[PDB]
Amino acid sequence: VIGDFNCTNSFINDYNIPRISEDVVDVSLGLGTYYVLNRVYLNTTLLFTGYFPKSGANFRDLALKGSIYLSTLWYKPPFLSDFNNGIFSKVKNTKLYVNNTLYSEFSTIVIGSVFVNTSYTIVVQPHNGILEITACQYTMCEYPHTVCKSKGSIRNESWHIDSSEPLCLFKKNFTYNVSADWLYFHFYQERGVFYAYYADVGMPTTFLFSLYLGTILSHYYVMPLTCNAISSNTDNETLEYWVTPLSRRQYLLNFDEHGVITNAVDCSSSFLSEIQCKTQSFAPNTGVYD
Amino acid sequence: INSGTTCSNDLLYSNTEISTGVCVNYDLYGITGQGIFKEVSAAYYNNWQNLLYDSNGNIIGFKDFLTNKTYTILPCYSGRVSAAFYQNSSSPALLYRN
Amino acid sequence: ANAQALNSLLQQLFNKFGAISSSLQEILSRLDPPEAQVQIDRLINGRL
Amino acid sequence: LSGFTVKPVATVYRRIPNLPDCDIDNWLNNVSVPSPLNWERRIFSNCNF
Ligand SMILES: *[C@@H]1O[C@H](CO)[C@@H](O[C@@H]2O[C@H](CO)[C@@H](O)[C@H](O)[C@H]2NC(C)=O)[C@H](O)[C@H]1NC(C)=O
Ligand SMILES: *[C@@H]1O[C@H](CO)[C@@H](O[C@@H]2O[C@H](CO)[C@@H](O)[C@H](O)[C@H]2NC(C)=O)[C@H](O)[C@H]1NC(C)=O
Ligand SMILES: *[C@@H]1O[C@H](CO)[C@@H](O[C@@H]2O[C@H](CO)[C@@H](O)[C@H](O)[C@H]2NC(C)=O)[C@H](O)[C@H]1NC(C)=O
Ligand SMILES: *[C@@H]1O[C@H](CO)[C@@H](O[C@@H]2O[C@H](CO)[C@@H](O)[C@H](O)[C@H]2NC(C)=O)[C@H](O)[C@H]1NC(C)=O
Ligand SMILES: *[C@@H]1O[C@H](CO)[C@@H](O)[C@H](O)[C@H]1NC(C)=O
Ligand SMILES: *[C@@H]1O[C@H](CO)[C@@H](O)[C@H](O)[C@H]1NC(C)=O
Structure with missing residues (x-):
């Protein structure tokens, strides 16, 4: 239930569960927060x-992997979640080694709405360390997927049938560290404009872009990776693609003399957090507050 | 014509020159204002950071991407004059404080 | 206390009071005159 | 008493481009010139020229 165009009808099975993790979101260290768009604060x-998680809700593993056959239940809820007001994603970098050569590939994200070909779809796709972010009129197939370059599978990756280049609003390429362990992503929308934030290594998150669309986005989806992949029948590997919702909340951030966040506190978590946010200091004075 | 996405960038980037501070206007990165500029070296900017803000929410610095330079913004002069005037006189005594 | 009072009085210029923004530069240069009058009036009322 | 407070001029405009440039002069000044019988055609879109 992603697209409205028939592209392939081969190896279509019926069924072969989001793994809820026990860990929680950590705060007061930098994880979860993000820098401003282009503003700098010093000391x-x-x-x-802004838009942040609340108290460390449980994550959901939305990573889908296939070997030969596909599934129809995969293109349906709860796998096709709802982009209510924001998404914070944590991706694990699958580092493969072939002929003493390192490769790093992971999943592909597509946010937007149904959008057969009427409205734009913001797709971020990785290519061996190059993040291509494109917002165009891409026509999503009825059963899209993504094959891997190194150790290719028997199928062919085809998620768009646009023979001609359509109109676009933002197409760009970014470069991240190809030998990283975890990646962080932060997406949300407000006042009609959609922002993006990414982080290759480090606790905070860096700025990506902000695009004016005028319409409200509906759903996001992570495309499966049908390739020689996490299946441990031959080589051991692990994929973790955690996704957590967002909420409009007020935090208190700190900036040293250089401009890097050292610690960030909430305002609706504990009784001390409210005092810290009222006094606007991490070490408030002695007194009786309401 | 006058549609689509491909356009011509010839009626927006015309001057492409920053003065040494004459209390001029600016419409930088969406935010607009007035003030003077001063050349001050800065080593705290990053690849994605181009503007400098304070705790109140004003503009302090600005990094130009077309020249790889960093300037600081000073507010314009807006004050009053104290005029002491006697009963019958031609011109009062003016004073500009500070 | 005097410094805090002065800072609180100065900070009122950054509030919107229901307007689209807190700066007249991007108000008089974005919308037509006959519809920014209410925004300017709300700003003036708040500041007064 | 107040002063003059004249209106400043010579505004400064800056904005980061969203879409990349078309770069038509690179193809127009290629090292190979096609024959009038071939007349190679190239389409450009979603760019800035
Ligand atoms: C937009 O997408 C629709 C489908 O979502 C396209 O309609 C298909 O067109 C092909 C080619 O003529 C047909 O073989 C299919 O049967 C059509 N699908 C349906 C559901 O009818 C359409 O061509 C796309 N482009 C435009 C400009 O509408
Ligand atoms: C972003 O990177 C991708 C992949 O490196 C670029 O896609 C390539 O485009 C060229 C020119 O059309 C093709 O010859 C290659 O085959 C493409 N590679 C792949 C893997 O499809 C894309 O052009 C880059 N975008 C920008 C704006 O630089
Ligand atoms: C960061 O800000 C703090 C808070 O003002 C600075 O600490 C003060 O520094 C001045 C000298 O610059 C001293 O006279 C004060 O006694 C300090 N106060 C406290 C509470 O430590 C600090 O110097 C600043 N760091 C910089 C500018 O690098
Ligand atoms: C401004 O400075 C940055 C950083 O030094 C320059 O970015 C570098 O550009 C070169 C050539 O394209 C690359 O090899 C480096 O990897 C870039 N470094 C970074 C950190 O991005 C940028 O080119 C400079 N701009 C101008 C106009 O001189
Ligand atoms: C990538 O990460 C590795 C391991 O932490 C590090 O050694 C290397 O310097 C990093 N490269 C870049 C460009 O950050
Ligand atoms: C684009 O053309 C205009 C028109 O003369 C010119 O003022 C401007 O400098 C040009 N821009 C570049 C990057 O050459």
Whole structure:
């Protein structure tokens, strides 16, 4: 239930569960928060109202992997979640070694709406360390997927049938560290414009772009990786693609004399957090507050 | 014509020159204002960071991507004059404080 | 206390009071005159 | 008493481009010139020229 165009009808099975992780989101260290769009703060405390998680809700593993046959239940909820107000994603870098050569590939994300060919779909796709982010009129297939370059499978990756280049609003390429362990992504929309944030290594998150669309996005989806993959019948490998919702909340961030966040506190988690946010300091004075 | 996405960038980037501070206008990166500029070296910018803000929410610095330079923004002059005037006089005594 | 009062009085210029923004530069240069009058009036009322 | 407070001029405009450039002069000045019988054609879109 992604696209409305028939592209392939081969190896289509019926059924062969999101693995809820026991870990929680950690705060007061930098994980979860993100830098401003293009503003810099030096040696100050900032009370900023943005889009963040609440208290460390459980994650959901939405990574889909196939070998020969595909499934129809995969293109349906709860795998096709709802982009309510924001998504914070944590991806594990699958580092493969072939002929003493390192390769790093992971899943592909597509946010937007149904959009057979009427409205834009923002797709971020990795190519051996090159993140291509394109917002165009791509026509999603009825059963899209993504094959892997190294150790290719028997199928062919085909998620769009646009023979001619359609109109676009933002197409760009970014470069990240090909020998990293974890990647962080942060997506949300507000006032009609959609923002993006990415982080290749480090606790905070870096800025990506902001695009004016005018319409409200509906759903996001992670495309499966039908290739020689995490299946441990031959080689051991693990894939973790955790996704957590967002919420409009006010945090308190700190900036040293250089401009890197050292610690970030909440304002609706504990009784001390409320006092810290009212006093706008991490070490408030002695007193009786309400 | 006058549609689509492909356009011509010839009526927006015309001057492409920053003065040494004359209390001029600016419409930088969406945010607009008025002020003077001063050349001050900065080593705290990054690849994705181009503007500098304070705790109150004003503009302090600005990094130009077309020249790889960093400038600081100073507010314009807006003050009053104290005029002491007697009963019958031609011109009062003016004073500009500070 | 005097410094905090002065800072709180100065900070009022960054509030919107229901308007589209807190700066008249991007208000008089974005919308037509006959529809920004209400925004300017709300800003003036708040500041007064 | 107040002063003059004249209106400043010579505004400064800056903006990061979203779409890349078309780069038509690179293809127009190629090292190979096609014959009038071939007349190779190239389409450009979603760019800035
Ligand atoms: C937009 O997408 C629709 C389907 O979502 C396309 O309609 C298909 O067109 C092909 C080619 O003529 C047909 O073989 C299919 O049967 C059509 N699908 C349906 C569901 O009818 C359409 O061509 C695309 N492009 C435009 C401009 O509408
Ligand atoms: C972003 O990177 C991708 C992949 O490196 C580029 O796609 C290549 O485009 C060239 C020119 O059309 C093709 O010859 C290659 O075959 C493409 N590679 C792949 C893997 O499809 C893309 O052009 C880059 N985008 C920008 C704006 O630089
Ligand atoms: C960061 O800000 C703090 C808070 O003002 C600075 O600490 C003060 O530094 C001045 C000298 O610059 C001293 O006179 C004060 O006694 C310090 N106060 C405290 C509470 O430590 C600190 O120097 C700043 N760091 C910089 C500018 O690098
Ligand atoms: C401004 O400075 C940056 C950083 O030094 C320059 O970016 C470098 O550009 C060269 C050539 O394209 C690359 O080899 C480097 O890898 C880039 N470094 C980084 C950190 O991105 C940029 O080119 C400079 N701009 C101008 C106009 O001189
Ligand atoms: C990538 O990560 C590795 C391991 O942490 C590190 O040694 C290397 O310097 C990093 N490269 C870049 C460009 O950050
Ligand atoms: C684009 O053309 C205009 C028109 O003369 C010119 O002012 C501007 O400098 C040009 N831009 C570049 C990057 O050459």
